Write a protein that binds this DNA or RNA. Structure first.
Length: 610
RNA sequence: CCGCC
């Protein structure tokens, strides 16, 4: 039943210069309002209580303040006043007014058919037209579960690697070419062709959002397939799984994902083969907390769940004469890699890593012991903890094997309770609105804002039981940010799907500026952006300075991502990429010397930690 | 707060 609270009223104003007794009409209208049958009638046409009331107020205001009323309606008013007409004889006119306020009502069925998201496999006739065999490589995080899949892909005549992260799409691109198997890179922000002339290699590595479902592939690898259930990003794994025209689809993920995949493949009638992988070296949950950093030991990783903690723990490590590496998600790619390369290096005294849950996926890290600094983000799910715990790995001179512990004593028994709790299997895969679907809604409801259309679409949508419609909060956020800029729905739609980090004012300001300039057909040149970011940029002096530089970096990424969809309007990507590699460079330095930034933050900006 | 496209 449509949630009528989503329908924003349209103003149907009264009309000016073009017998008629008002104290009478009032009495008629007010009875019109009260007849349990009129209400029950309205209800028939989908006007429940709230819509009835809102339509009625407008209608009654309409009738009462309009200089000239449409002729057919006067005639009907006179009869209920001074003839043998029943209230009911107004209802057809009421209904017309209502439908002008609430156009939804003229098209509930249309709206349902457009948002019918049932039997998603049918969205992919090319994949339906071929034999596809599924190979699920199930194992916990760090069980060499990917390894076999990758080789099969390297030796296939053609293949695609779908990754959960820019990082992993980069790693395989790098590992494939180094394996002498020419491989193109395809991500949102970056598209690299390796071939001399400029033709497509027969191997491609990409972030999952970007893979083609109309190219043939001998082999495809979809990595981290349990992400199919991620509230925001899930739709992308479902697309890859259902739609890749590969002769063998190799998935790699956790056992919790096997059931859903089986239900899915059943509806496609494709064969599935599970292959089990056990953990490389086993998982010993400790007995002694870290208690105090006076036990920090080469190979330790202290995992934090807020940046304040990152700066706090790393500070302490420096005051205690010990050297450390830092890793959090929003560090540029190069810096992350460089920070790990130090923590990994055997000839490097740096042997403590202070990190966020950013490490649970994407980086080659040689960690001996994981130390959960705390256990709260709500406590951390089994999946979450297991993912992270599972990073403890080598150092293989009798320190093979991995260890896990909390920071404090209060926390340790809880970590134990968590890690041996059974994992709920995943129940459904995500879907999302397509641009074309929303474009159709927008034809039906031209006066609804984009953000409101997403809500209405979602309310009207229908999915089979093994699926669910993805979160759209991010998209709705951008839609709200840019409602006041004139753009066709197609263009607006694309701008709203650009991945930005809402929590950063500069990124938001830039989304605005880019969209404004676009709408004004005024290209965003290399020269323009350099003025706008206020370049050149100096080394950071303190944390605020790093955050600001990370922000600018995020703005360059937003530009590049855009340059693939709007090429004339974003014409100088190569140049912007160059300037960004230069910025990742600046950040790397300021990050090497992070302890001094925390100092100038904690002694002058006194950023206290705890 | 984190994670991320």
């Amino acid at each position: 039943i449509p949630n009528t609270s989503l329908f924003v009223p349209l103003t149907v104003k009264p009309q000016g210069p073009s017998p008629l007794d008002k104290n009478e009409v009032k009495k008629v209208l007010d009875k019109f309002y009260k007849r349990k049958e009129i209400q029950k009638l309205g209800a028939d046409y989908g006007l429940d209580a709230r819509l009835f009331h809102q339509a009625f107020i407008s209608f009654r205001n309409y009738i009462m303040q309009s200089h000239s009323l449409d002729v057919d309606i006067h005639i009907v008013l006179n009869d209920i006043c001074f003839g043998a007409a029943h209230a009911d004889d107004l209802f057809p006119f009421f209904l017309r007014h209502a439908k002008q306020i609430f156009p939804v009502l003229d098209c509930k069925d249309d709206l349902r058919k457009i948002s019918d998201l049932r039997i998603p496999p049918n969205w992919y006739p090319d994949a339906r037209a071929m034999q596809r065999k599924i190979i699920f490589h199930s194992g916990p995080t760090n069980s060499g579960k990917t390894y076999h899949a990758i080789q099969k892909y390297f030796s296939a005549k053609s293949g695609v690697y779908c990754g959960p992260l820019k990082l992993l799409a980069h790693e395989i691109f790098e590992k494939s070419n180094a394996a002498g198997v020419p491989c193109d890179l395809v991500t949102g922000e970056e598209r690299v062709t390796v071939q001399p002339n400029g033709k497509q290699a027969s191997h491609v590595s990409c972030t999952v959002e970007m893979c083609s479902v109309t190219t043939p592939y001998e082999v495809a690898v979809i990595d981290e397939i349990q992400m199919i259930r991620d509230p925001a990003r899930g739709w992308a794994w479902t697309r890859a799984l259902l739609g890749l025209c590969a002769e063998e689809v190799h998935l790699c993920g956790e056992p919790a994902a096997i059931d859903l995949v089986m239900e899915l493949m059943y509806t496609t009638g494709e064969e599935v083969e599970v292959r089990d992988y056990k953990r490389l070296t086993p998982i010993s949950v400790l007995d002694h907390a870290l208690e105090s950093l006076d036990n920090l030991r080469p190979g330790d990783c202290i995992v934090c769940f807020s940046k304040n903690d990152i700066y706090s723990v790393s500070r302490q490590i420096e005051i205690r004469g010990l050297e450390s590496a830092v890793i959090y998600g929003s560090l540029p790619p190069g810096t992350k890699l460089a920070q790990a390369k130090k923590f990994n290096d055997p000839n490097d005294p740096c042997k403590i890593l202070v990190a966020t849950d950013a490490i649970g996926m994407g980086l080659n890290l040689s960690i001996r012991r994981i130390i959960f600094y705390s256990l709260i983000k709500e406590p951390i799910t089994t999946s979450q903890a297991l993912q992270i715990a599972g990073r403890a790995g080598r150092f293989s001179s009798r320190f093979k094997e991995g260890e896990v512990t909390t920071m404090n004593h209060e926390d340790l028994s809880l970590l134990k309770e968590i890690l041996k709790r059974p994992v709920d299997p995943i129940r459904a895969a995500g879907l999302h609105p397509t641009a074309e679907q929303i474009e159709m809604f927008a034809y039906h409801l031209p006066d609804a804002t984009l953000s409101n259309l997403i809500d209405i679409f979602v309310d009207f949508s229908q999915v089979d039981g093994q699926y669910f419609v993805c979160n759209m909060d991010d998209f709705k956020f951008s839609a709200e940010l840019i409602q006041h800029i004139p753009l066709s729905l197609r263009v607006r739609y694309v701008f709203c799907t650009a991945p930005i980090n809402k929590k950063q004012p500069f990124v938001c300001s830039s989304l605005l500026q880019f969209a404004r300039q676009y709408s004004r057909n005024e290209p965003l040149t290399f020269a323009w952006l350099r003025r706008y970011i206020k370049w050149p940029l100096l080394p950071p002096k303190n944390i605020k300075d790093l955050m600001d530089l990370e922000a600018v970096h995020d703005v360059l990424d937003l530009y590049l991502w855009l340059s693939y969809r709007f090429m004339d309007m974003f014409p100088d990507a190569s140049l912007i990429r160059d300037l960004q590699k230069e910025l990742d460079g600046i950040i790397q330095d300021g990050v090497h010397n992070i302890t001094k930034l925390i100092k100038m933050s904690e002694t002058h900006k006194l950023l206290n930690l705890e």
